[PDB]
Each structure stands twice: as structure tokens, then as C-alpha cells.
Design a binder for this molecule. Structure first.
Ligand SMILES: [Mg+2]
Ligand SMILES: [Mg+2]
Ligand SMILES: [Mg+2]
Ligand SMILES: [Zn+2]
Lengths: 94, 134, 38, 136, 135
RNA sequence: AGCCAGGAUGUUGGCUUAGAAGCAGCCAUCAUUUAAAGAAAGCGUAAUAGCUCACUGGUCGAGUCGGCCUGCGCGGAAGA
């Protein structure tokens, strides 16, 4: 059972998102259902390792944000053009 | 110390035996008819492997062994030559029984703890030479 | 001695060694395998 | 050797080669050879590399070529001055941007695909890297 | 090499054999070709004796289960165990003439009675008759 | 990692060949006894023999192996 630690993003747009990745973090988004989308930021190495196991893309994951647990599934993923890296992830509330 | 596979009641020839152990210091005629003398009891036309054992004074002893698996399998399949392409071209059939017989002879010569094991080895040969077990 | 830009182990008895700032292949088995980067 | 069978026009502006690649995932095979650098691949290069990887697997499995050299390149020969009309078309290139999967492959063990793609990459004028299929 | 699941299974089996047997003879067997081993195997199967080379670490685990814990110290150096599961002795016998004859390896300590048996004095087991001698 | 020892049986596998025995080439690559030992990784022979590797028991006693993201360097580097 995957557990991902996230903080809500304080900024948005291109500048903020590139600064995240220069800092070994990367943006992501949680949408679905009744609640509003929740823009977040993730630790790159931690999620990189996780998603190298097929289970990630097919299991109910739990994102922890301010000590709250959100149950999600991976929905889309943007990868770097040619490095073993993640640019962004969509999670849909499960 | 040399190892050959010689025809039962036959020995002496130059390209076959002569030169081979002849160039080690071995008395040809002696071994020829001693070999034949003891291999008289073998069935006709069974190629039998002999281990020749020579000592510094050119004198020698030897042990006779059971014929090769390939040989017995050739004879059991009623054929003359193994497949040129084993398991791509099949060239015949030995029953499980024939396997077992050959296995008991070669059992006198195997290292199998059981009939089944020996038989499996003989099967291994039979496979190796494109003979099917039928 | 083979002298070239790309030096490698050519067999299991080849060793890469650096001597005096220069990369080399030394072999204990085949003299032809001996190289110097250059 | 790849070439468009026919085209609307014979000749093409030089143009530029900015941007990241489209078609960055392994979409047909199991493994892929991906461009890490920017540049032009000629039809002869693409061919040389296709041969190499295909020797390497002993024509087993299956191979896909994701790029196609559809850009005509012209040249002026020796001892001709500038102007007097655009040069003659001599060969064809594909424009390559970082991230393009160049070749794909499957039906072979990964170890053999890496070797084959290693041999092929030595024929190409742009750095490349080895990639794999991914769920999503 | 040998995964942990392997070695656990190797122990279990050697231990189960140890429960059924009645006389264990331990020897060095280093420096003997496989043909003379293969020969000793036909002599073990013939005489109903179970033969194994096993890691000294791994044997210590089998032993402890009972009643061979005296043999621990016999597991320094290359080790060959001999389990006479049907009848007692005959292995102790067999190993020594085989030991003497081949002037390679040595023989360490045997064990019967839950008592370690000292290299020299093993001559006890190596002279115990047949079962099948009391008649 | 180093060092000791083993690396066996059918069997010289089948075909081919003057010979082809793990080791020119072609096909097969099973099975046995195994702690382990490929119908053989390389040298070797006219063919054997002979050396060695894979693999395994022993000794030693706490680390060891090599892919990933990255910083700075090294070779590649010859001219009047
Ligand atoms: Mg900007
Ligand atoms: Mg110097
Ligand atoms: Mg070691
Ligand atoms: Zn070398």
C-alpha cells in the first residue's frame, strides 16, 4: 500500500513549477468528485522509486497532506523528454 | 595408458589399432589375440570399448567394458548410423523395454543407483542420436 | 602497444591502470591487448 | 533507404529545429532508442543503424522505425558561385529533437536489445539512450 | 549460490536422516578425486549407508536437534558425514580401509550412543559384527 | 578478494572426417553420481594427452558488487 507525502502548493505557473524541479520536487494535481482540485508538490526521488513498480499505476494509493489522508489512483503522468524523471502527475480521487 | 573401442573377435589392423597404441610401446599381436581371446564370448559385431594399461617396461594389462550406448541403441533401432541431425531428423524406435535391456548391460557399466536412472541416461543417448524411443 | 582514443579490456586478463595520468590496458595473457590511451 | 515516394514540392526552406520531441514513449515494441540530443538524421544513417541492430538480433523479433526522412536537403557543387537559383536536392534528413524515440523493438531479451541498440547508436550523429515501455 | 530457503531445506533433510540413522561417521575427504568417491557411493548404497558432504555451519544446525551435539567440534575443516540408517557400523568399518588404502584424507570422530567417538579408538565400531551375528 | 582441494559417469553424444575424443564444422544438449562439475569458457594435440574456466566443499572473518541523479577534473589534443 503506497503512501505519498505531499504539501499543498503555495504558487502556480511555469516559474514556480520549474523552481520546484530544480529543488528535487515536482508538482502534481488531485481532482475528481465534489471537492476542488488540490495542487500539490512531491518529493521526486521518493515517488520515482515508487512508480517503478507496476502496482503504482493500478492500486489505490494514499496521499498524505497536512496529516489528512486522500485516497487516489494515478491517472496520467508527464515524464521528462529523455531523463529518468517525472515532471507532473494527475491523481483522481478514488 | 590408452582407451580404444575395438570390434569383438577382431584386432591388429594398422589404421584402426596398430599406430594408435603401437606408438606408445605396446606389443601388438599379444594384445590382439588376448583381446580377441577374452572377447570371443561377446555377440558377433558388437563394438566393445577396452582400456589398455601400459607400464614403463612396455608390458600391459587391460579392462573390457560394455559396448557404447550409441552402439547398443544403433543395434536396438536396427539401424547403422545415428541421425546427422538428431531431434531434427528422427531415425527410429526403441521401446521402453529395449532401453531397459541396454540400461542393464550399461548398468553393469553405469553409475545409476536404480534401473530408472540408468534407463534415463540411455534415453539421454537415444535422444542425443535422433533415435526416438517408441 | 596499441595507441588510441578508445582503450578497453579485450579479455578477462586485461586490466585498466592509470600510470602517470595516462590510461592503459595491461594484459597478463595476450601482449596484443596492451594499450595506451593517446 | 528511406525517402518520400512523391512530394508536393521539390525543395524546402532551411527552417529551424527548436523544441522538444513529439512521440517520446515506446508505443509499439518493448524497448526503444531515444534521442537525447538535437539534430539531423540522414537516410543513410538511419539505414546504417537499422542494419546494425538487425544483424545484432539475427533478424529475430521485430523492429520499428519511428522517424522518417522527409526533408530534402540541397547543395551547390564545387566551383559554382553564390546565387543563380537554389541548389539541387542531394539527400533527405529527418529533423530530430530531444526526446524522440527513434527505433523500437520487441520479441528479444532486453540484454540483446541493449546490445543491438548499442551497435546502432554508434552509427548516429546524436547522443541517444535506451528506453523501455511503461504502463501509462 | 544458495538462497536462504535452499539452506533451510538442506538442513531439514540432513536432520530427518539423522533421526532415522543409528551410527554417524565423520571424516575429511579433501584431496580425493570423484571416481574414488563415486566408488565409495556404490559402497554406501550397497551397504545401506547415506553419504553427504555438507557445510560445517549447516551441519551444526542439523546436529543440535539431538543427539550428535558432541560432533560439533568435528566440524572444523572439510567434512563428510556417513549415516548408516539401516544396520549400525559398516560405514565406520568401510571408511577406515578406504582411509588407509588411499592415504589421502584422515577421518575425524565417529558418534554412536550419543557419545563422541575418538579418531583412534573407532576400531570399536569398525569391528562390531553382523546383526545377524548373535545366532 | 586471496589461498587449499575437487571439476566425475553414460561418453570418444550423434553426424562428418584420414582424424574430430568438451574445444574445424553441423545437429542435439539430455541423464546419472553429485558438495559441485557446461555433451564445455579459453589455451593446447595429427587425433588423444596436458593446462585452465564455469560450479562446489574448505580456510579467512566484515564487509562487498555495480547501475541511477548530479558537481569539478583526465585522455582524445600535430604547424611552420
Ligand atoms: Mg519565464
Ligand atoms: Mg614514465
Ligand atoms: Mg572465497
Ligand atoms: Zn587481455
Amino acid at each position: 500500500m503506497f503512501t505519498i507525502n505531499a504539501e499543498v502548493r503555495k504558487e502556480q505557473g511555469k516559474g514556480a513549477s520549474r523552481r520546484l524541479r530544480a529543488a528535487n520536487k515536482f508538482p502534481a494535481i488531485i481532482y475528481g468528485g465534489k471537492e476542488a482540485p488540490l495542487a500539490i508538490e512531491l518529493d521526486h526521488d521518493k515517488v520515482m522509486n515508487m512508480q517503478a513498480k507496476a502496482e503504482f499505476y493500478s492500486e489505490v494509493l494514499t496521499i498524505v497532506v497536512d496529516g489528512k489522508e486522500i485516497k487516489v489512483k494515478a491517472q496520467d503522468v508527464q515524464r521528462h523528454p529523455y531523463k529518468p524523471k517525472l515532471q507532473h502527475i494527475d491523481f483522481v480521487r478514488a | 595408458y590408452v582407451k580404444l573401442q575395438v570390434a569383438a573377435g577382431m584386432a591388429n589392423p594398422s589404421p584402426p589399432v596398430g599406430p594408435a597404441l603401437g606408438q606408445q610401446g605396446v606389443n601388438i599381436m599379444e594384445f590382439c589375440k588376448a583381446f580377441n581371446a577374452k572377447t570371443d564370448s561377446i555377440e558377433k559385431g558388437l563394438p566393445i570399448p577396452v582400456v589398455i594399461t601400459v607400464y614403463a617396461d612396455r608390458s600391459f594389462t587391460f579392462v573390457t567394458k560394455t559396448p557404447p550406448a550409441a552402439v547398443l541403441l544403433k543395434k536396438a533401432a536396427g539401424i547403422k548410423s545415428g541421425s546427422g541431425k538428431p531431434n531434427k531428423d528422427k531415425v527410429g524406435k526403441i521401446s521402453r523395454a529395449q532401453l531397459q535391456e541396454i540400461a542393464q548391460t550399461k548398468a553393469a557399466d553405469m553409475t545409476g543407483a536404480d534401473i530408472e536412472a540408468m534407463t534415463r541416461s540411455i534415453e539421454g543417448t537415444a535422444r542425443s542420436m535422433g533415435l526416438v524411443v517408441e | 602497444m596499441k595507441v588510441r582514443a578508445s582503450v578497453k579490456k579485450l579479455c578477462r586478463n586485461c586490466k585498466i591502470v592509470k600510470r602517470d595520468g595516462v590510461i592503459r590496458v595491461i594484459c597478463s595473457a595476450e601482449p596484443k591487448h596492451k594499450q595506451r590511451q593517446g | 533507404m528511406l525517402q518520400p515516394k512523391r512530394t508536393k514540392f521539390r525543395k524546402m526552406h532551411k527552417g529551424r529545429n527548436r523544441g522538444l520531441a513529439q512521440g517520446t514513449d515506446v508505443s509499439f515494441g518493448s524497448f526503444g532508442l531515444k534521442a537525447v540530443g538535437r539534430g539531423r538524421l540522414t537516410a543513410r544513417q538511419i539505414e546504417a543503424a537499422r542494419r546494425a541492430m538487425t544483424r545484432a538480433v539475427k533478424r529475430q523479433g521485430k523492429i520499428w522505425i519511428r522517424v522518417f526522412p522527409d526533408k530534402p536537403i540541397t547543395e551547390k557543387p564545387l566551383a559554382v558561385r553564390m546565387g543563380k537559383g537554389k541548389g539541387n536536392v542531394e539527400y533527405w534528413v529527418a529533423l530530430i529533437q530531444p526526446g524522440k524515440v527513434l527505433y523500437e523493438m520487441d520479441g528479444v531479451p532486453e540484454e540483446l536489445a541493449r546490445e543491438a541498440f548499442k551497435l546502432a547508436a554508434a552509427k548516429l550523429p546524436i547522443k541517444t539512450t535506451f528506453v523501455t515501455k511503461t504502463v501509462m | 549460490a544458495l538462497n536462504l530457503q535452499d539452506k533451510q531445506a538442506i538442513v531439514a533433510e540432513v536432520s530427518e536422516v539423522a533421526k532415522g540413522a543409528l551410527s554417524a561417521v565423520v571424516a575429511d575427504s579433501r584431496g580425493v578425486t570423484v571416481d574414488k568417491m563415486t566408488e565409495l557411493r556404490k559402497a554406501g548404497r550397497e551397504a545401506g549407508v547415506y553419504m553427504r558432504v555438507v557445510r560445517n555451519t549447516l551441519l551444526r544446525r542439523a546436529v543440535e536437534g539431538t543427539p550428535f551435539e558432541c560432533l560439533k567440534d568435528a566440524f572444523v575443516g572439510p567434512t563428510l558425514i556417513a549415516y548408516v540408517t539401516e544396520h549400525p557400523g559398516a560405514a565406520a568399518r568401510l571408511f577406515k580401509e578406504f582411509a588407509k588404502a588411499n592415504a589421502k584424507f584422515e577421518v575425524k570422530a565417529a558418534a554412536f550412543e550419543g557419545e563422541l567417538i575418538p579418531a583412534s579408538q573407532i576400531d570399536r565400531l569398525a569391528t562390531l559384527p553382523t546383526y545377524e551375528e548373535a545366532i
